[PDB]
Amino acid sequence: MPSTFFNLTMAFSLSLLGTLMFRSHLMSTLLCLEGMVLSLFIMTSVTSLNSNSMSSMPIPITILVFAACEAAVGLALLVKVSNTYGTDYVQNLNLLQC
Amino acid sequence: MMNGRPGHEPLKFLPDEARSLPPPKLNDPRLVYMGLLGYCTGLMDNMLRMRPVMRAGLHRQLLFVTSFVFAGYFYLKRQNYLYAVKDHDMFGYIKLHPEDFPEKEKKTYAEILEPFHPVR
Amino acid sequence: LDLIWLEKTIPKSTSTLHTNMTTLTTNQKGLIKLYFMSFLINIILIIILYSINL
Amino acid sequence: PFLDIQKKLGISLDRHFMFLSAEQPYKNAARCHAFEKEWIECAHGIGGTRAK
Amino acid sequence: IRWTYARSANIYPNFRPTPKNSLLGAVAGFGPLIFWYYVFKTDRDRKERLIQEGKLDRKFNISY
Amino acid sequence: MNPITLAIIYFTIFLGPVITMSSTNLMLMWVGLEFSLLAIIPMLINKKNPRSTEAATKYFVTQATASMIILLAIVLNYKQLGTWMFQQQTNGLILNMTLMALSMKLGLAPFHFWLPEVTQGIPLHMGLILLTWQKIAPLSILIQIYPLLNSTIILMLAITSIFMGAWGGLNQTQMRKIMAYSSIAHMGWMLAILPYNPSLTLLNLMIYIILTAPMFMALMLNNSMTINSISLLWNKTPAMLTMISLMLLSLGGLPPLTGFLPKWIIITELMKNNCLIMATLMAMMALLNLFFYTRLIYSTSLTMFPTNNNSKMMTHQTKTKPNLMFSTLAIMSTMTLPLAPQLIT
Amino acid sequence: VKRFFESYHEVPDGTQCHRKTYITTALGGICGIIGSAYSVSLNPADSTLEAVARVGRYTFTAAAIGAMFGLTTCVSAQVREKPDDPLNYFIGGCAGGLTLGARTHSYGTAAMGCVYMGTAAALFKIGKLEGWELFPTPKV
Amino acid sequence: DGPEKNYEKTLAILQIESEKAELRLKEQEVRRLMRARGDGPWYQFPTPEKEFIDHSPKATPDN
Amino acid sequence: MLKIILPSLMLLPLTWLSSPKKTWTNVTSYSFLISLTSLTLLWQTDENYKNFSNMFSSDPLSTPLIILTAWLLPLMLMASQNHLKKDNNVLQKLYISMLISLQILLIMTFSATELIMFYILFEATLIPTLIIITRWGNQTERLNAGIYFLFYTLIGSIPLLIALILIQNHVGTLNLMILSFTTHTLDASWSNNLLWLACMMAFLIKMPLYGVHLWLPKAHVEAPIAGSMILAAILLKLGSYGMIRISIILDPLTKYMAYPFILLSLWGMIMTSSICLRQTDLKSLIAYSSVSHMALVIASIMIQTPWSFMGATMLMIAHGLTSSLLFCLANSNYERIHSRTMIMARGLQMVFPLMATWWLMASLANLALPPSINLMGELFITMSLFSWSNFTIILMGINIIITGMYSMYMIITTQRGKLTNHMINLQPSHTRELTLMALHMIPLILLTTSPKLITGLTM
Ligand SMILES: CCCCCCCCCCCCCCCCCC(=O)OC[C@H](COP(=O)([O-])OCC[N+](C)(C)C)OC(=O)CCCCCCCCCCCCCCCCC
């Protein structure tokens, strides 16, 4: 459990580094966001199963539902970006600087 | 800072203990200013809606003044209770901790030697 | 003393300083890639500051 | 909480599963139930600073 | 109007800092200040030393 | 939008921060933040232009990253302490994760690079409800854990927030961006007074909201997005120039306007806790904020910019746009300084 | 590095002059690396070569500022035989400002840097002598 | 009216201001001490609620 | 003090409810009655200070400034009535409202017994000066003048606010009499030096000191006549009252920290008098003369002699009256000729003989003609400065010589000489403007007759 939770935290940190460090694909950025979501699910589930906290067992389902609604809204925004600009490259969304 | 005190019943505008306090005298500068702000609000609203400033919406101006005085009176009662309970907790803590607040034997202007700085 | 050097020294120099610095701080390109690289730098610096402060 | 609507109305929307030694399904105690209970009855009524 | 504008509202638009006017402004804004500072400081320390040593006499000086 | 989805979206926008404040569980505060973000996204996207698309996309990715960092800190605290609240002995790294993520959510520097970006491109009522309502819930979370946070990082964030807010508001012309940088500076003041007295943080939040709302409403009167657009206000509605001047001076913090009171009492408490250097630096940056407010006053009220020929049509037509709620908030945000002991606690 | 920064003050001014210069140069170099990272992040270069070039230029400019600051403050304190006086720090901050102006190639920036950095160093020395708190823990 | 009215009004003003100054100084000292070691009404930070702990016998006797 | 503040407050509804054909008459008459009511503060038959309430107090120093403000307001209305004649009624009533707000806030500022309230009213009276100068000024750099004025004053005043809050936290009440009684010595540390500088620099900007005086000439040139009168007659003295109030808790390190400001004041009054010699603008000439006289006041306040304080206070009152009179005469010529050029109108003694008499009297007051309160204050400042250091008499002599030169040069180039016969639009005289000069000059003669009213705190 300590090594497992340490590498889970490192997986979250790597997914956060990928989310912060953009490449050309907003789709890849969203995928990094759900990498963070999945790491959070795994950490919460492992903690609840280790502590035998059946009162806190609703928390993984809660984060799954809420972050999945988040992902659906983000997919809708990516759809709007792609429909507006043909492609979903993130460098096109820069006309609000001025 | 006072939200964690003992006997703090949650989300109470005016607890019953506050009823031991003197109410505002209902003609005091704070409530008079609240009524003046209500009247100025009505006048400014008349100007912004492009009506006669004093000759239009007399019921509206009366409603503004009355609502401002009402809200100011009850908020002033709550604030008076808050200041009173702050002072009461302060004096209670001072009484309960007398070693931390010693009376200083403050001495006269006959033994202390204030330095003299001439202006010349 | 009035129309050249005190005016160059106090008010116009403060105005020029703040104009240069506001150009520097509002030279933003509007790219969320650069913005999130900036946010990553902020995260690294705050983590380092916590590590050295403890 | 910042707003004490749950304490004012007397309801418990989310206060009954804050910690491991709270109510559990079919009376199955979580780990360190006794330790966390003793910590909470120690810390109760004296505030955070005196609790620490 | 042109003379007044050139004398008042055009000097700072047509001023450019050179070494010469930098030195001139520095000396004209500080040299009198440093000189009078030294004059008044030496005079006041001389008066102070005289009055604590006791040799300076204020026979009827009460309207100081 | 039909009234059914209007009511549901607006109710969820209302429900998010209310859930966040009412809940004692960190998870339910997180889901309140989730409701707020998800509910407000369609209202930003509503106008259906590429600028609205950019603003919604940047706002979403920023709040997504900040919400995941919030969730990471909550999960780490649950692993360390077994409970769902940062009680007294949670890790300082976890608390700094919360502070950085909530500063990202609020939009203060050096996490402020999206707030003018998002505020531009959305309608003025969207900028209003964002810059007023969406900051109560993260500030509520920050207030709930005030005695545990790290004053060094908080003061550094506040200092850089007001510095870049003052410099930005000094720079650009666009009114929504001006309000965004004003928001950044005011949130810097809020965050600085947060670890010592959260009551003054709430007082600054209330004063900022009741000052920021009515001048957004005056912007929505003529949909003036530009300094020039608010500069020809004298031909359109000359009855508003005096209140615009008073609200801008109150936002600048000039006495005897009641917007001087938050900065004054914050400086008082900060000097009670002995951070003279921060108090003075924050005051000079507030002076720069007052500079760009005063430039706005010069543009709209104290001078008289040239107008067009169709302003004759605009004066011919009548309008009933300003509601009764504008004047009450303007008066309570302009002429309320002598009630300072009542305003403070 | 916190031990390094508090080991700056283990000896009075005018003593261990090389060590003081090295510590202040290191602090200026760290500030230059941070500023260069922010600069190449917000304002990317056209290629990695001149990106690293401006990183090196910013780091060297800030390191020169710190080095001349430490050397000038230490030399002034040593040759005037009084360590706990803010004038030495003011001359050091002015020397750092002239270093900034010499790197920027403008006497106007040199003079502004002299005045501002000398004032900043003077108040830093005053605060260190008389116990000012930059980051105070909440007491009331 | 006369000099005694102004004299005694000044005395009343001075007494009120001196009492206010002493009360402000004592308020600062009380707030400092209370935050340093919270044992009075103020600066009482929250604590998990005791009333939501199960005391019934459970499935595992080692509790 | 309430019996003066309240009817001045009620002047505003009188302004906004009066008929458009009667508002000037009503406000002018009732403001004259306000000044007459404000004359009751001179009933000072005993050495105790008039403490009216826990909020307002009167003083031998505060009383002349309050009376001067209450007297100045109707003269401001008289001066402003002409250039606003082609204006809307709401604009005229707004201008009168700004003047009345200035008058109220300045009375409350001088009668404030508590320095935080003093600062609140300090910025409160900062605001409508900005509004007046920037809205009713004439040419295009009035906005620049407003920015310089406001930001010089605010950058000065912010460390004053910090120093005041530190003083309140250290002592407990910051009430002026409590501070004066239970003051304590300062340990001559660097923190105390910075505290002293912070609580001195706000007033030093306001007076102004030399080197930070740059906001004043542009503000007076681009201001309307009421703005020039209110600035040059009240706000510099407001700064002066500021140092006299704050300096009592700063012993003893003002003795050595006074050195740069005295030197700046002496060399600055010499420099500004020289600028008055080679000045091409009449309003700028009066403005730089104001800078020189206020530099004299600065030097007296910093050397802290009782004779310096008394001469400073009398110079405050004298300079307020004579600078307002000079600005009024310059504005009369400006509404005649639509120009501020010093040399454009030359032979005005021919066509305005009575106004030339007023010009001569104003300049004779300016160059300190005895037995007037001008030379009374100037001579006592000279005495105290000579007692401080005997070599100050050289700078004083140079300043007095150049003062006489610029005053007589102004008279010679504006009244004396050949008449510019091309100026066909020279109306003879307004009874309003002649009354304005008379109401400026008669209190100067009365205060010359009885100088005990303005002798200030020390004597
Ligand atoms: C118009 C002039 C403006 C600039 C000059 C203003 C005054 C200059 C001297 C004072 C320092 C700066 C103001 C500090 C205000 C508070 C003073 C005080 O309380 O001191 C005691 C305090 C010390 O408090 P203390 O006295 O309790 O010290 C602790 C003492 N023990 C431990 C024994 C209890 O001084 C400070 O803390 C001063 C820190 C100031 C740091 C920031 C300064 C920034 C720059 C300010 C000016 C910016 C505008 C001008 C820019 C250039 C324009 C051309």
Ligand SMILES: CCCCCCCCCCCCCCCCCC(=O)OC[C@H](COP(=O)(O)OCCN)OC(=O)CCCCCCCCCCCCCCCCC
């Ligand atoms: C001998 C005594 C010596 C000691 C005392 C020295 C201090 C004296 C008092 C300070 C005087 C400051 C004067 C400030 C006003 C003058 C500057 C100005 O007016 O700038 C105008 C300019 C904008 O002009 P703009 O409108 O764009 O165009 C002109 C017409 N269209 O504006 C700009 O370009 C930018 C203006 C920014 C705002 C300037 C005012 C606020 C300055 C805040 C300073 C903060 C200092 C601390 C900062 C952090 C630490 C470095």
